[PDB]
Amino acid sequence: DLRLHLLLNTSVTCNDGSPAGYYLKESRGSRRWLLFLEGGWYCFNRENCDSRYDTMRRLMSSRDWPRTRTGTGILSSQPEENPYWWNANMVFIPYCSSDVWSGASSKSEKNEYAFMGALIIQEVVRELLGRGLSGAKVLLLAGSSAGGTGVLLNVDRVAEQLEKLGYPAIQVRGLADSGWFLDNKQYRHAPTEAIRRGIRYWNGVVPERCRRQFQEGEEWNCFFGYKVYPTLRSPVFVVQWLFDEAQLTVDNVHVQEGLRLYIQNLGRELRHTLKDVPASFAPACLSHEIIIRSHWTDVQVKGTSLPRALHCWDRSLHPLKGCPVHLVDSCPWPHCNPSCPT
Template sequence: MLCFLQSPRKHARNVLHAPVEARRVRGGRAQTRRVQQQQTPPPYRERVEGAESFPLDFTAVEGNMDNFVVQIKNLAQSLYPCSAQKLDQDMKLHFLKNLSVTCNDGSPAGYYIKESKGSKRWLLFLEGGWYCFDSQTCESRYETMRRLMSSTKWPLTRTGTGPTCLFLSRAPHRFIPYCSSDVWSGATPKTDQSKTQCVIAQCVSLWLWLREGFIKKDLSVESKGFVRGLADSGWFLDNKQYKFTDCLDTISCAPTEAIKRGIRYWGGLVPESCRQAHVGEEWNCFFGYKVYPTLKSPVFVAQWLFDEAQLTVDNIHLTGQPIHEGQWRYIQKLGQELRLTLRDVPAMFAPACLSHELITRADWTDIRVKGISLPRALHCWDRSLHHNLHINSSHGHQKHTTPPVRGCLLQLIDSCPWPHCNPSCPTIRDQLTGQEMSVIQFLKHMGFDVQKMAQQQGMEPKKLLGMLNNGN
């Protein structure tokens, strides 16, 4: 989960210049020199077939050449992938002084920080990493995934990649490692009943220590900031498993049952508005499509339509062997169901790919939906929020229904019906040989029947194969 925090601006000039920071998707010195060498902005270059537009808002300039130059620089910076940007410094590890907030093994919780002066925007990245829901699953997790339960071996520094270079190198960065195994919701006091001390130890709510540790010292107490979020690969469905199994571990346990057990074990806290909507069934608030309508702050959803973690808990295990027809139909149905739950989300990026986690991938800037990359979509979303904030500056909070600015598409979701039908999907490798697989090889490997699929799509098999070969 990625959170963007911003303190309010008191003057119009600050409001106008605020989007500059958030729009620096791939800023850096080299990019600035490139702009100075060119008299006119170059066209946007695509890695995948299909042009991605980058409109310049001349109406917003109103004679202010500085704003126009900012737009030109922003266009040039968008031509470069995030991986090309070198952050000025590594993020440094800081442990919390509040000893009541610890990891599962009792070691101190902490965060990585990249300091910055002059920016009133913050980038907070909450690491993910699944969960455990009883002493048995937690002890198993401690043996196999100790890094996600202890801070004892955290490196002193880490380099910002993916989400931490998403917005401005000038903004302060906070990377918050996940070591509580409670989906960032636990409030159960620490005990020593387990030999691994594998219990939830977050006695203070996440927001409380974020506010006390990060925000309060940098933002005036009387100010009211704005929060917006980016949810990556956390839009799970409480659907029926392909094959029911007893809830013996976190992999085989159905999502609904696992959350029900977990929320009791963690003493899980959910947003008050969602709790009121699901009194007595607060577990519903752990599923994106149920909690989303209750949120007041804008959230951008980045989600693979065929999420590997979702398939795993649904007992669809892609082990390298061809799958059965029933499994193939289940996978297709999963994509359809997920699309339906996203229909009312105004800002999303949902490629029809088989994968898990998006913004932490090295190639996250290469994925396209309708010819538009995720950095570009986030840039448009940020502009739309700022545009709406500037126009409605007297309102107390931002709304989900922020309209996109001219030339921006925010509801980006693939319509093709099977995994990896999007040609920009991440490369697939055969799990047995390690060799790269083409889309056709992958689909056939999964049991894809060209004749049946062509019939379903109302076209000739040769035409379907041609479309797949051409990446359409």
């Protein structure tokens, strides 16, 4: 169990003005810290944010949060469930800003909702420094789906925050799970348009180098992994199913020749965008998210499991014989890999 702490700075808030927070389980014998960003889509105007508030309120408010959470998968403290980092200090940051962790805007007389995702991350880091993070040697910022995109948008800002606060020895790294999307043509006919509107509605922020490349009005580009990743300085490990269910949903896919070619082309395009990503794990499965699932140890690429690949990544950051870090399936159809989730 990880225990809830609401932020002491109560001006950093969820969508409805209630305080944001984090769940923590400390491990006093460890200098490793895992901060995980929850996912859960987004909203991008008054009407569809009002709908989300009626039936997805825990993603917009802390008023109903429970006092504890069980750590699962990479957040588990049992070595049987988490071969990679079972002895680490564990942090789960709930997603209550509906802005893909990009927002910097308060609720006001002109704003019905607050969108503070980028500020929530920075405030969690600040308050944790007084609870042990000041002695860390590695801070791994991880996340799934909207939280995986949030890693890409925020990992270099966390690195800059700690450098400016006087902690240049903490190594900041990122782990992006299921947040690497393609701005491709839909099968029938979008993310690019909804994100462009959202950025304006949220006062959303993107990494500085990527912002400088694409410039004003084109910051939506930095929400797509293959465009923002080459601009990042912190080491980032990318986990991505080749046939991600959220990708197929936004593509209006729910088998004849036209759809067969569409699905095969999507897998090939995703594989191409990862060719020069040296730390990556990309199985040929139809699924969505993995790193906080209890059975995340089951899937393998080329005979290597995801917890093993992450361990090999740690060693590489001190090629290694028998301990690879770049693992991308080459077979072209969902579940051509026998270890895919059932």
